[PDB]
Amino acid sequence: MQLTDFKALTFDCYGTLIDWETGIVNALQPLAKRTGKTFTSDELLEVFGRNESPQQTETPGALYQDILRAVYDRIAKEWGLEPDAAEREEFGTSVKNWPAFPDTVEALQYLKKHYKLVILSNIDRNEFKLSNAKLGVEFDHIITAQDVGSYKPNPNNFTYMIDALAKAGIEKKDILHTAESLYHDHIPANDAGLVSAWIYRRHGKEGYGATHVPSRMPNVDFRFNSMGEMAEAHKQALKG
Numbered sequence: 617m618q619l620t621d622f623k624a625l626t627f628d629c630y631g632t633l634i635d636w637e638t639g640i641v642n643a644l645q646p647l648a649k650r651t652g653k654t655f656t657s658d659e660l661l662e663v664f665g666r667n668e669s670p671q672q673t674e675t676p677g678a679l680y681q682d683i684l685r686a687v688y689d690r691i692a693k694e695w696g697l698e699p700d701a702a703e704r705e706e707f708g709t710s711v712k713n714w715p716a717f718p719d720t721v722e723a724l725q726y727l728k729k730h731y732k733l734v735i736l737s738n739i740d741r742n743e744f745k746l747s748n749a750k751l752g753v754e755f756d757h758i759i760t761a762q763d764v765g766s767y768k769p770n771p772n773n774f775t776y777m778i779d780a781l782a783k784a785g786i787e788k789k790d791i792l793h794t795a796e797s798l799y800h801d802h803i804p805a806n807d808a809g810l811v812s813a814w815i816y817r818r819h820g821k822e823g824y825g826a827t828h829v830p831s832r833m834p835n836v837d838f839r840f841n842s843m844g845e846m847a848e849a850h851k852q853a854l855k856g
């Protein structure tokens with residue numbers, strides 16, 4: 617099993633390609649100021665992570681800004697605060713400001729020479745365009761939660777993706793699903809019969825950050841600590 621066996625990379629975006637943690641910590645600062653407490657980054661991230669997937673179950677057809685607005689309301693409620701409409705809007709429209717990780721553009725541009733690059737992300741189409749402008753590549757296919765009518769880890773998100781790629785001549789065996797999230801991505805990839813590459817962005821940190829806790833450790837086929845490290849691996853695999 618090696619990287620060159622695959623024709624397509626299918627990606628998790630937020631937490632793998634885009635550094636959503638930096639974005640969420642920054643966007644929660646005004647709400648946090650109202651509590652009087654200094655929170656650590658992990659505290660902010662974990663209250664997000666206990667709330668985002670429940671919200672996506674609650675409103676599975678919501679656009680992502682509406683998810684984020686409702687997550688703001690959930691966090692405010694854990695903190696004993698009444699929501700403030702303008703603060704909620706500033707949080708919920710913050711994806712425009714969530715940066716790429718510093719290795720992402722270079723890695724994606726390299727990998728685009730060798731694979732079809734696909735997005736399977738908990739996002740809506742228009743919102744994703746904002747992030748795509750920070751990623752430096754044309755994606756061959758983009759599958760969003762909006763397209764499916766639900767969010768990962770719903771199995772239908774993976775079936776939709778697999779089907780779309782089959783119609784473009786990419787068999788399931790051709791796909792390498794590339795993602796940080798054990799909960800959103802590699803557990804349902806296991807169940808869907810996909811090969812997995814774990815991009816362990818938090819390898820040097822505690823817990824899962826903004827990502828929901830996974831119910832088990834899925835079985836992954838590759839692990840890289842960053843996207844640059846995946847690209848460097850491919851440059852040697854290609855010589856074989």
Ligand SMILES: NCC[C@@H](O)C(=O)O
Nearest residue numbers: 628629630631737738
């Ligand atoms: N890392 C969790 C979120 C991600 O899977 C995405 O849908 O972009």
Ligand SMILES: [Mg+2]
Nearest residue numbers: 671674686690
């Ligand atoms: Mg509710």
